[PDB]
Write an enzyme that holds these catalytic residues in place. Structure first.
Site, PDB file in Angstrom:
ATOM      1  N   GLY A 156       0.762 -51.987  51.707  1.00  0.00           N
ATOM      2  CA  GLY A 156       2.009 -52.697  51.456  1.00  0.00           C
ATOM      3  C   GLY A 156       2.123 -53.195  50.029  1.00  0.00           C
ATOM      4  O   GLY A 156       1.392 -52.749  49.142  1.00  0.00           O
ATOM      5  N   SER A 175      -5.679 -50.301  51.644  1.00  0.00           N
ATOM      6  CA  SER A 175      -4.895 -50.904  50.568  1.00  0.00           C
ATOM      7  C   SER A 175      -4.874 -52.438  50.680  1.00  0.00           C
ATOM      8  O   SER A 175      -5.930 -53.062  50.689  1.00  0.00           O
ATOM      9  CB  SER A 175      -3.489 -50.291  50.535  1.00  0.00           C
ATOM     10  OG  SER A 175      -2.708 -50.852  49.498  1.00  0.00           O
ATOM     11  N   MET A 176      -3.696 -53.044  50.789  1.00  0.00           N
ATOM     12  CA  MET A 176      -3.597 -54.504  50.838  1.00  0.00           C
ATOM     13  C   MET A 176      -4.127 -55.085  52.154  1.00  0.00           C
ATOM     14  O   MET A 176      -4.407 -56.281  52.238  1.00  0.00           O
ATOM     15  CB  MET A 176      -2.149 -54.956  50.617  1.00  0.00           C
ATOM     16  CG  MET A 176      -2.011 -56.326  49.969  1.00  0.00           C
ATOM     17  SD  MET A 176      -2.519 -56.351  48.235  1.00  0.00           S
ATOM     18  CE  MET A 176      -2.471 -58.108  47.895  1.00  0.00           C
ATOM     19  N   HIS A 179      -8.248 -49.882  47.865  1.00  0.00           N
ATOM     20  CA  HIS A 179      -7.517 -49.436  46.678  1.00  0.00           C
ATOM     21  C   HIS A 179      -6.007 -49.538  46.884  1.00  0.00           C
ATOM     22  O   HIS A 179      -5.451 -48.915  47.792  1.00  0.00           O
ATOM     23  CB  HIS A 179      -7.898 -47.996  46.318  1.00  0.00           C
ATOM     24  CG  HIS A 179      -6.929 -47.325  45.390  1.00  0.00           C
ATOM     25  ND1 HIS A 179      -6.210 -46.204  45.748  1.00  0.00           N
ATOM     26  CD2 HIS A 179      -6.549 -47.624  44.126  1.00  0.00           C
ATOM     27  CE1 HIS A 179      -5.437 -45.837  44.742  1.00  0.00           C
ATOM     28  NE2 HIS A 179      -5.623 -46.683  43.745  1.00  0.00           N
ATOM     29  N   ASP A 209      -9.558 -43.840  45.293  1.00  0.00           N
ATOM     30  CA  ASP A 209      -9.492 -43.952  46.753  1.00  0.00           C
ATOM     31  C   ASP A 209     -10.871 -44.146  47.374  1.00  0.00           C
ATOM     32  O   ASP A 209     -11.881 -43.725  46.811  1.00  0.00           O
ATOM     33  CB  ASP A 209      -8.844 -42.709  47.366  1.00  0.00           C
ATOM     34  CG  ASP A 209      -7.406 -42.526  46.937  1.00  0.00           C
ATOM     35  OD1 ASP A 209      -6.750 -43.516  46.547  1.00  0.00           O
ATOM     36  OD2 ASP A 209      -6.929 -41.379  47.000  1.00  0.00           O
TER      37      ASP A 209
HETATM   38  C1  LIG Z   1       2.390 -55.209  40.257  1.00  0.00           C
HETATM   39  C2  LIG Z   1       2.527 -53.695  40.461  1.00  0.00           C
HETATM   40  C3  LIG Z   1       2.564 -52.975  39.108  1.00  0.00           C
HETATM   41  N1  LIG Z   1       1.430 -53.199  41.329  1.00  0.00           N
HETATM   42  N2  LIG Z   1       1.651 -52.803  42.439  1.00  0.00           N
HETATM   43  C4  LIG Z   1       0.517 -52.421  43.021  1.00  0.00           C
HETATM   44  C5  LIG Z   1      -0.463 -52.623  42.155  1.00  0.00           C
HETATM   45  C6  LIG Z   1      -1.779 -52.418  42.227  1.00  0.00           C
HETATM   46  C7  LIG Z   1      -2.603 -52.727  41.145  1.00  0.00           C
HETATM   47  C8  LIG Z   1      -3.992 -52.525  41.188  1.00  0.00           C
HETATM   48  O1  LIG Z   1      -4.750 -53.240  40.527  1.00  0.00           O
HETATM   49  N3  LIG Z   1      -4.432 -51.512  41.972  1.00  0.00           N
HETATM   50  C9  LIG Z   1      -5.834 -51.137  42.080  1.00  0.00           C
HETATM   51  C10 LIG Z   1      -6.484 -52.205  42.957  1.00  0.00           C
HETATM   52  C11 LIG Z   1      -7.108 -53.278  42.473  1.00  0.00           C
HETATM   53  O2  LIG Z   1      -7.554 -53.988  43.543  1.00  0.00           O
HETATM   54  C12 LIG Z   1      -7.165 -53.286  44.646  1.00  0.00           C
HETATM   55  C13 LIG Z   1      -7.431 -53.669  45.890  1.00  0.00           C
HETATM   56  C14 LIG Z   1      -8.636 -54.063  46.300  1.00  0.00           C
HETATM   57  C15 LIG Z   1      -8.669 -54.414  47.600  1.00  0.00           C
HETATM   58  C16 LIG Z   1      -7.489 -54.297  48.217  1.00  0.00           C
HETATM   59  S1  LIG Z   1      -6.386 -53.744  47.106  1.00  0.00           S
HETATM   60  N4  LIG Z   1      -6.508 -52.186  44.289  1.00  0.00           N
HETATM   61  C17 LIG Z   1      -1.992 -53.250  40.003  1.00  0.00           C
HETATM   62  N5  LIG Z   1      -0.613 -53.442  39.993  1.00  0.00           N
HETATM   63  C18 LIG Z   1       0.119 -53.126  41.067  1.00  0.00           C
END
Ligand SMILES: CC(C)n1ncc2cc(C(=O)NCc3coc(-c4cccs4)n3)cnc21
Ligand SMILES: CC(C)n1ncc2cc(C(=O)NCc3coc(-c4cccs4)n3)cnc21
Ligand SMILES: CC(C)n1ncc2cc(C(=O)NCc3coc(-c4cccs4)n3)cnc21
Ligand SMILES: CC(C)n1ncc2cc(C(=O)NCc3coc(-c4cccs4)n3)cnc21
Ligand SMILES: CC(C)n1ncc2cc(C(=O)NCc3coc(-c4cccs4)n3)cnc21
Ligand SMILES: CC(C)n1ncc2cc(C(=O)NCc3coc(-c4cccs4)n3)cnc21
Ligand SMILES: CC(C)n1ncc2cc(C(=O)NCc3coc(-c4cccs4)n3)cnc21
Ligand SMILES: CC(C)n1ncc2cc(C(=O)NCc3coc(-c4cccs4)n3)cnc21
Ligand SMILES: CC(C)n1ncc2cc(C(=O)NCc3coc(-c4cccs4)n3)cnc21
Lengths: 188, 188, 188, 188, 188, 188, 188, 188, 188
Positions: free
Chosen positions: D64, D93-94, D118, D167
Site C-alpha cells: 500500500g 511491502s508496507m 521492500h 525484492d
Molecule cells: C514517498 C514516495 C516517493 N514513495 N512511495 C513509496 C516509497 C518507497 C520508498 C522506499 O524507501 N522504498 C524502499 C523501502 C525502504 O524501506 C522499505 C520497506 C521496508 C519494510 C517495509 S517497506 N522499502 C521511498 N519513497 C516512496
C-alpha cells in the site's frame, strides 16, 4: 471530400495544393499546433517562390491555441510578401486575431461572414503548478493580445480590454467599423 | 465506394474529380467546416479555370452549420460564374438555403426531391457564456437568414419567419411555387 | 491539412519535404521518440547532402521527453553543419533546450514567441522499481540539464538551478537577455 | 462473502465486528487511505474501551501507500494498549512494516506465512512538479523507513538499506531470524 | 471495510459513528463538497449535544476544493466548542489549512505525519468565461488563504506567500517550528 | 461519508436527518430536480410538524437548474415558517438566488463564504425547436430572475441586469452591502 | 439526499413516506414506467386508507411517456378521493396533462411555476415495423390527448390542436387563463 | 479485399473502376447518403462519356434511406442512357425499388436472387418535433412509394399498399410474376 | 511527422528510406515483432546490395521482447557486412543488448546518451501453463543473455549476473568503461 486536379506538362495536385500554386492558403479548421506548422510552412514556401507577389489567406476558423496563433501571426509579419486576408463563414477567437493581422489595406470579409474577438482559455496545464505565475501569465497574455489588436484596429487599448473580455458577434459591416477589416467584399 | 477513372493523353481521376473537370461540384453530406472548406476551394478553382462558363452544384444534404453554410453562400455570390443548382434526394435545413442561393434562372430540382426550409440550432458553445448576447445572436441570425431567403424566393419577410420557424416538407412542385427553385427538372 | 507541391524536371513533394529541399527542418509538435527519430534522420540526411551549408530548425514545441530531446541535441552538435534555430509560437520545456542548443551566433526567435525553461517529469516507469537510484537519477538528470544549459546561456550554474526548478515565461527580449537566444528576429 | 452474527441480550454484528468485540482487528487488503482511516478508528476505539487489555492485529496485505502505512504505525505506538501482530498468508511491502511495528515480545506469524520487506513507489504526483525535492523526498522516505525498521528488527542500518532496496521473500523462520517477528506460531 | 459496533441499553453504530459518540470526527479523504457537508453537519451536531466539551478532528487528507475547505473552516471557528486537531499520515493542500485552523493550544500531529502547505488549482470552470476576473480571483483567493494562514501560524505574510506558492514537505517537527501545529504528539 | 446517530427512547437517524429533527435542512450540492424534490418535501414536512417555529437552511451550492431553483423558492415563500438562510463555502448561480430568498431579517453568511449572482444557461433542449420563443424565453426568464432579485436585495432593476449578466465574486461583506444577505455571521 | 424521520409511539419513515402519511404524493422526476407504477400504488393505497379525504399531488416533471402518463391519469379519475394538484418548478409535456387532470376546483400552481403543453414523441419501437398503423397511431394518440385536454381546460378542440403541436411556455397566470389550473397559489 | 488492374497504353484501375470503364456500376451495400452520392456521380459520368450506350447496374443491397434511394432513382430516369438492372444475392427494401426502376425491357435477376418490397422506417429525427406532420409525412412517403412502384410493376395501387406494408420474400420467378423484373437471367 | 525526399534521375523516398540508400538503418522504437521483422529485412537487403560495405545502425529504444531482440542479433552476426552501432537518446533493456552486439571496433554512443542493461520480463503467456519449465526458462534465458553479453563486453560472467539483475543507468563514459561501447562519439 478531397478531390484531385492534374494538367498537361503528369502533375498530381490536390484541390488545396492547386490553390497554393496561385499563392492561396486555405484555413478552414481550429488553429492547433499541426495546422499552424503547416500554415507557417506554406508562408515560408511562398516567400521562397516569390518575395514580391501577394499571398491570399482565406480564413474560416472558430478559434484555437494562443501560442499556435502567434506562430502564424509572427510568420505573416516576418516575411516580405503582403499577406491578404479574406474571412468566410466566421472568424472567431484566434481566427479574428489573424483576420486583423493581414496586410494593411488588404483585409477583407464577405457580406455574411461573422466575427468574434474573444479568446477563452485552454493550455492551463503548464501554468497550473505555480499560482502567482499562472494568474499573471493570463494578464501578460491579455496585455499581449490587447496591445497588438489595438495597433491594427487602430482603437484605444481601453475599448479593446472590455470587448475582448466577453463574447462578441460582429457582422462584416460592424467588423469594418471596428477596424478589424478594411472592406466588405461586395459581389464581383 | 469511390471508383477511379483514367484516360489516354496516364491521368488518375476519382469519380468526383472527373466530374469537377466538367465543372460539376457534388455535395452529398452534412455541411460542416471540412466540406465547406472543400466546396469553397472548388468554386475558387473553377473560377480560375474559366470565369465565364457555368458551374453545376448538385445538392443532397440534410443540413449543417450556419456559419459553414454562409461560407459557401458568400463564395457562390462573390465569384463571376453563374452557379447552377440541382437538388437530388433532399435539401433540408442549410441545404435548402444553398438551393435557393443558386444563380437566378438556373435553380433546379428533380421530381421526387424533398425540400425543408428550417435550421435548428447547434453551435451553442461560444454564445452560452453571456446571456443577453446569446439570445440576441439567435434573433440576429434569424433576421440574417430570413432576410436573405426572402430576397431570393421573392416572398415577404412575414411569411418566411413563420415557415422557417417550424419544420417543413416541400415537394419539387411546392418548392417551385414557394420560389426556392425555378423549375422542376423533367426527365430528359 | 498537408498540401502537395510539384515542379517540372514529375516530382511529388509535401510542404514539409519541399522545405527540407532548402535545408529547413520544421518542428511543431511535442518531442516524443517518433518525431525525435525523424528529426535526427533529417539532420543526418542534410549532412550527407552538404556538410558545409547551414541547416534551419524552426521550433514550436510545448515540450517532450528528456531522452528524446538529448537525441536531437547530440545529433545537432555531432554533425558538421551549423544548425540555425528560429523559435515561433512557443519554446517550452525541452523545446527551449533545443532552442539554446543552436549554433552560436545563429539562435533566433520572433517578437511574440514565448519561452519556458523548465522540464517537469514523466518517464517514471523504469526508475520506480528501485528507490535510491530513482531519486538520484532525477538529480543526475537535473545536473545534466543545468550544466549544459549554463554553458550555452553563458550564465552561472547557481542561477540556472533556481530558474529551471519552477515554471517560467520569458519573452523574446527576456530570452535574449537570458542568453537562450542571440537576437530577436525583427520584421524583414 | 460477509456473514452476520447475533446473540441474546437483538444485537446485529458482522463477522469482522464480532471479532472487534474481542479486540481483534482484521487487515486483509492493500493499505490505502480508506482502510487506514478505518484501522486507526478501530485502534482509537479499542483504547477508549480498555487502555490496558491487548489488541490483536491480523495482517494479510500485499502492500500500500507509505503515508497510509505510517498513519497506522504512529497510531499503534501512540496508544497505550500493546498491539499484538499475527501475519497470515503474506506480509509484503508496507504490510511487513506494520508486521515489525507490533508490540515487542508479541510479534507473530504462522508457519507458511511469507514476508517481503521492500516498498516500491507510487504517489509520484505531488512530487513530480519540482525536481530537486522529488528525488530527495525518496531519499528522505528511504532514510525514514530504513531507520525505523532497523530499530525494531534490531539490525544495522547498512544491512537494511541493501535488503529494502530490491525484492525479498522471507519465510516465517527467516523473518524470525531477521528480527521482523519474535516467534513462529506453532499449531495449538 | 466498515465494521459495526453495538452495546446493551439494541443500538447499531458504525465504527465512525461510535467515535462520534465520544466527540471524535474522522477525516480520511479528499475534501469535496460531499464530505464537507458531512463534516459541517457533525460539527453542528456536536455543538447541539454539548457546546462546552471539546471536539476531536483527526485529519488524513491529500487536499480538496478551496470553497469546500472554507466551509469546514468557518464552521469550526463559528461554533463554541474548541475543536482539537490531530494530523495522521499526511495533511496536504487544504488539509494543512484545517490543520492550522484548530483551536489555539490544541493543534497536534503524530511523529511520522507529513505536512504540505500548497493548494494547486481546480474549480476553473465558472471563472474561465471572463478574463480580468479569473486572474484576479486567483489573487484574491491567494490573498484570502495567505492572510488567514499567517494569523494562525503567527508568521509574516511575506514568508507565507513564497512557501505557499510552490510544493512543500514539512515533518511533524518542522510543522511545529512553522507554527502550523502546537505540539508533536509523543507516544502515550 | 455518512454516519449514523441513535438515542434512547431504538431510533436510527442519519446525520442529516438528526439535523432535520432540529428543523435544519442541509443543502450541499448542485440544484437538480432530485435534490429540489427532497428539499421541498422537507420544507412541507417541517411546516406540518410546526408552522410557527423557524427553519434553518444551510446553503453550499455551485448552482443548478432555474426551474429546480424556483420550486424551492416558491415553497419557501408559500409556507408559514420563516426560513432562515446561512451560506457556507459558496453560494453561486441559483444558490445565491435561494440565499436572498430567505426570510427578511434572517439571511446570513459566514466570513469566508463566497457569493456569485449569475445563472448561465442549460435546459436548452425543449426551447431549441422553435426560434422566436427560445430567444424570448431567455429574456422572460431574465426578466423573471432580475425582478425577483431586485425586490429582495432592495436595489434597482437596472443595476441587477448588468451584474447578473456577467460573472461575479462577492465576499460576505460585499454580499451584505449588495443586500443579498442581512448580516455576516461573526464567530460565536 | 434522502433524510429519515421517526416519532414516538420506533417508526422509521423517509421524508417522502412521512408526507404520504398526510396523504401527500411527491412527483419530482420524468414520468417513466417505474415512477408511474409507484404513483399508482400510492393512489390505490391512500384510497384504501380513506376514500373520502383528499389527496395532494405535487408535480415537478419535465415530461415522460404517454402510456405511463395515462396510467396515472386513469387511476386518479378511477378512485373516489379528490386528488388535488400543486405545480412547482415546472410542469412540462405529460406533467401538464396530469396538472390539468386534478380534481375540478382543486388545481393549483405556485407563482413562478412554468407550464408547457406539448408532448414530443418517443416509444417509436413497436410502431416502426408497420407503416400505415405507425402514422395513424400518432394521430389517434394526438386525438386522444387533445380530446381529454379540451374537456378539462374547457376550451375548443381546434385551439388545443395548434397549441399542443409546437412548444409552449405558460406562466402561472397564463396557465390559469388557459384553464389548465384553477388558481395561482398566493403566499400563505 | 480490393484488387488492382492495369493495362499497357501505365493505367491504374481498381476492380470496380475497371468495370466502370465498360459502363458497369456495382452496388453491394446499404443505400446511405455516401454511396448514393457516388452512384449518382457515376450515372452522370457515364452519360457524359456516352449518352446513347446502355448502363449496367448490379444490385446487392439489403436496403437504406428513402431520400437516398430517390436520389439514385431520379438520376436514373433523368439521364438519357437506358440503365439496365441485374439483381444478385438479394434486393431488399429500397434495393427492390431501384430494381424495378430499371429501364423497361431491361430489368433482370439471377435464379437464386431474393427480393423484398418493404421499407421499414428510420430518419425519424427531423419529423419527431411536430406531431401532425410526422404522421402525415409517413403517409405522404407511403403514397409516394406505392404510386411509383405501381406504375413500374404495372399492378393496382390497392395490391401494392398491402404487400408493401408487411415483410416479403419473393424469388426470381415470383418477382417476375409481380412485375418487379422482366426476365429471370438463365445461365449463359 | 514523416517527410518525403526525391531527386532527378521521379524517385519518391521517405526520410528513413533515403537514409537506407546510404546504408543507414534507424531504430527509434520499442523492439516488437513488427519492427524486428523490418530491421531484419533491411539487414538482409543491404547485404544483397553490397556484402563488403559497412552498415550503420542508429539505436534509440527503451526495450522490447527477448525473442524479437535475438532475431535482430542473430541477423547482424550472420551477415557479412560489419554493422556499426551508434546509440542516441537512450539504449535501455534489449536496446543495450543490440548496442553491444555491433561490430567489434565500431560500437559508438553520443555524449549524453544513456544506457541500461536490464531486461524485465513479459512474454509470460506460453510458459505460465507448466511450472517447472516456466521458472527454468527464465534461468535459461538469463544464462543465454548473460553469456552473450559477457563475451562482447569482455567482462566476467559473475559481474554481469549482478548488474543485469537490477536496474541500471550508465552514461556514455561508463558504458565505454563497461565494454558495451568502444568510443564516445565526440562532436565532429
Ligand atoms: C514517498 C514516495 C516517493 N514513495 N512511495 C513509496 C516509497 C518507497 C520508498 C522506499 O524507501 N522504498 C524502499 C523501502 C525502504 O524501506 C522499505 C520497506 C521496508 C519494510 C517495509 S517497506 N522499502 C521511498 N519513497 C516512496
Ligand atoms: C495561454 C492561456 C493563458 N490563454 N489562453 C487563452 C487566453 C485568453 C486570454 C485572454 O485574455 N483572452 C481575452 C482576449 C484577449 O484577446 C482576445 C482576442 C483578441 C482577438 C481575438 S481574441 N481575447 C488570456 N490568456 C489565455
Ligand atoms: C447561430 C445559432 C444561434 N443558430 N444556430 C442555428 C440556428 C438557427 C437559427 C434559425 O434561424 N432558425 C430558424 C431558421 C431561419 O432560417 C431557417 C432556415 C432557412 C432555410 C433553411 S433553414 N431556419 C438561428 N440561430 C441558429
Ligand atoms: C525521467 C526523469 C529522469 N526525468 N524526466 C524529466 C526530467 C526532468 C528533470 C529535471 O531536471 N527537471 C528540472 C529541469 C532541469 O532542466 C530543465 C530544463 C532545462 C531546460 C529546459 S528544461 N528542467 C529531471 N528528471 C527528469
Ligand atoms: C479559486 C480557484 C481559482 N482556486 N482553486 C485553488 C486555488 C488555490 C489558490 C492559491 O492561492 N494557491 C496557493 C496557496 C495559497 O495558500 C495555500 C495554502 C496554504 C495552506 C493550505 S493551502 N495554497 C488560489 N486559487 C485557487
Ligand atoms: C430557461 C433557460 C433558457 N435558462 N436557463 C438558465 C437561464 C438563465 C437565465 C438568466 O437570466 N441568466 C442570467 C441571470 C439572471 O439572473 C441571474 C441570477 C441572479 C441571481 C441568481 S441567478 N442570472 C435565463 N434563462 C436561463
Ligand atoms: C404514441 C407515441 C407515437 N407518442 N409518443 C408521444 C406522443 C405524442 C403525441 C402527441 O399527440 N403529441 C402532441 C401533443 C398532443 O397533446 C399533447 C399534450 C398536451 C398536454 C400535455 S401533452 N402533446 C402523439 N403520439 C405520441
Ligand atoms: C420518411 C420516413 C418517415 N420513412 N422512412 C422510411 C419510410 C418508409 C415508408 C413506407 O412507406 N414504408 C412502406 C413501403 C412503402 O413502399 C415500400 C417499398 C416498396 C418497394 C420498395 S420499398 N415500402 C414511409 N416513410 C418512411
Ligand atoms: C523469456 C521470458 C521469461 N523473458 N522475458 C524477458 C526476460 C528477461 C530475462 C532476463 O534474464 N532478464 C535479466 C537480464 C539478463 O540480461 C539482461 C540484459 C542484459 C543486457 C541487455 S538485457 N537482462 C529472462 N527471461 C525473460
Amino acid at each position: 471530400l478531397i478531390p484531385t486536379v492534374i494538367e498537361t506538362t503528369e502533375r498530381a495536385y490536390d484541390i488545396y495544393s492547386r490553390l497554393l500554386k496561385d499563392r492561396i492558403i486555405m484555413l478552414g479548421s481550429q488553429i492547433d499546433d499541426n495546422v499552424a506548422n503547416s500554415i507557417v510552412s506554406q508562408l515560408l514556401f511562398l516567400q521562397a517562390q516569390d518575395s514580391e507577389k501577394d499571398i491570399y489567406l482565406y480564413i474560416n476558423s472558430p478559434g484555437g491555441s494562443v501560442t499556435a496563433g502567434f506562430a502564424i501571426y509572427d510568420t505573416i509579419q516576418h516575411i516580405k510578401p503582403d499577406v491578404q486576408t479574406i474571412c468566410i463563414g466566421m472568424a472567431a477567437s484566434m481566427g479574428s486575431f489573424l483576420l486583423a493581422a493581414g496586410a494593411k489595406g488588404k483585409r477583407f470579409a464577405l457580406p455574411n461572414a461573422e466575427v468574434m474577438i474573444h479568446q477563452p482559455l485552454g493550455g492551463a496545464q503548464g501554468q497550473a503548478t505555480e499560482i502567482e505565475i499562472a494568474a499573471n501569465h493570463i494578464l501578460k497574455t491579455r496585455e499581449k493580445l490587447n496591445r497588438i489588436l489595438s495597433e491594427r484596429t487602430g482603437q484605444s487599448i481601453e475599448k479593446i480590454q472590455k470587448d475582448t473580455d466577453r463574447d462578441n458577434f460582429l457582422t462584416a459591416e460592424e467588423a469594418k467599423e471596428y477596424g478589424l477589416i478594411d472592406e466588405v467584399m461586395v459581389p464581383e
